[PDB]
């Protein structure tokens, strides 16, 4: 699957910006906090696992919420509605078989109605102006993974997990583009497992170096170290699974030598 490879990357690189959330958005949200968002995102991971939905779908949802919240005030009491509608749309976009609306009502233990979820769905489509093909940390990762010598599943799964980790903490990751996060996640995965660095083929491809990833890498390396004590555990729980080669069990490195 190339051709194309470069064109698409170039294209996602541009949409990345076009699609980035507002970095400060949470400061402007009277009734909600990064902390509650984390809960939402964590909840969505659980759901993702529950329904066996693509990681991409999870990544799409969070892009939606963050974009939606970048321009719509929401009361804590409705933040979850925004969450499900986001997941529903993500599902409808990405999934071969999206869960039916009822299922999303049901996973809130009936906190909203099919009618609320649908009406929230419209709102979100209105607020995003149907702009749903968002580049994701995951999208960039699957590209980066192609530059591995040779392919390694623990690396692939560990980047996923790490990338997925970042979705939870608006502060700081909200300030880094999906390709940059995917850079940190990828290299951190490769180092941890193999003791290898960010590939020069990827420098050629991305124009990123360890130099440029560093800031994010520093943040990602902390999230990795502080992962077992994080308030939210659904992602580590998820990545205990054999499906993901139990990568959340592998030990974070003590240092990076950067």
């Amino acid at each position: 699957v190339p051709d194309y490879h470069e064109d698409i990357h170039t294209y996602l690189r541009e949409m990345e910006v076009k699609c980035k959330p507002k970095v400060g958005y949470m400061k402007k949200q009277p009734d909600i906090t990064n902390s509650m968002r984390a809960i939402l995102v964590d909840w969505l991971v659980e759901v993702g696992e529950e329904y066996k939905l693509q990681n991409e779908t999870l990544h799409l949802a969070v892009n939606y919420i963050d974009r939606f919240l970048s321009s719509m005030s929401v009361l804590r009491g409705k933040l979850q509605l925004v969450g499900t509608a986001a997941m529903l749309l993500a599902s409808k976009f990405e999934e071969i078989y999206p869960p039916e609306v009822a299922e999303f009502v049901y996973i809130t233990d009936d906190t909203y109605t099919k009618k609320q979820v649908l009406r929230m769905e419209h709102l979100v489509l209105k607020v995003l102006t149907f702009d749903l093909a968002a580049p994701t940390v995951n999208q960039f990762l699957t590209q980066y993974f192609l530059h591995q010598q040779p392919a390694n599943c623990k690396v692939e799964s560990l980047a996923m997990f790490l990338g997925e980790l970042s979705l939870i903490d608006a502060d700081p990751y909200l300030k880094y583009l999906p390709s940059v996060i995917a850079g940190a996640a990828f290299h951190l995965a490769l180092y941890t497992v193999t003791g290898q660095s960010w590939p020069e083929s990827l420098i050629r491809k991305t124009g990123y170096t360890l130099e440029s990833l560093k800031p994010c890498l520093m943040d990602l390396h902390q999230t990795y170290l502080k992962a077992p004590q994080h308030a939210q555990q659904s992602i580590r729980e998820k990545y205990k699974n054999s499906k993901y080669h139990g990568v959340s069990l592998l030990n974070p490195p003590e240092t990076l030598n950067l």
């Binding site: 909840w43 009491g77 933040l79 979850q80 969450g83 809130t108 906190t111």
Partner: peptide
């Protein structure tokens, strides 16, 4: 599950 209230 319900998330906040």
């Amino acid at each position: 599950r319900k998330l906040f209230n």
